[PDB]
Design a protein around this ligand. Structure first.
Ligand code: ZN
Length: 157
């Protein structure tokens, strides 16, 4: 077994920029509800994940299949790591311009996460679990959340 080392505040893994091929790849443009690319998004209703849904639109649940798959893996590992605690998404797909100009939040490929108990002391380890779950980039971006993203299916030729 490998020793699990939490990420430190502001650390990202892998240790390269988010939008490189070694990580989550390119920004492919905002997805709006009216977009053809809205069909890239699938609603995640995993009962073992809490969604903050601050906008009251369900947008946090709408994500690409790869994002869903990694999130669902992470949900198992979070409950393994801290029995009685669940994975929580505090921000997923952004319909409303609240991130930097080319954020993967705009295309349903990034989620900001916490544990369900909002114990900030758990977040460094949560970030390491997100790496182990196969997220393509994980960034301990603020004391309040870990930013996790995935590559798209559009760069493999
Ligand atoms: Zn984020």
């Amino acid at each position: 077994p490998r020793k699990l080392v939490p990420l430190a505040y502001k650390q990202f893994s892998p240790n390269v920029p988010e939008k490189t091929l070694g990580a989550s790849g390119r920004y492919e443009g905002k997805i709006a509800r009216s977009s053809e690319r809205f069909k890239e998004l699938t609603p995640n209703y995993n009962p073992d994940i809490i969604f903050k849904d601050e906008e009251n639109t369900g947008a946090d649940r709408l994500m690409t299949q790869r994002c869903k798959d990694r999130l669902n893996s992470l949900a198992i590992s979070v409950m393994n790591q801290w029995p009685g605690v669940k994975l929580r998404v505090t921000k997923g797909w952004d319909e409303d311009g609240h991130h930097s100009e080319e954020s993967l939040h705009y295309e349903g490929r990034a989620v900001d996460i916490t544990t369900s108990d909002r114990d900030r002391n758990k977040y460094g380890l949560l970030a390491r679990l997100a790496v182990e779950a196969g997220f393509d980039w994980v960034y301990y971006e603020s004391k309040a959340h870990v930013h996790c993203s995935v590559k798209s299916e559009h760069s493999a030729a």
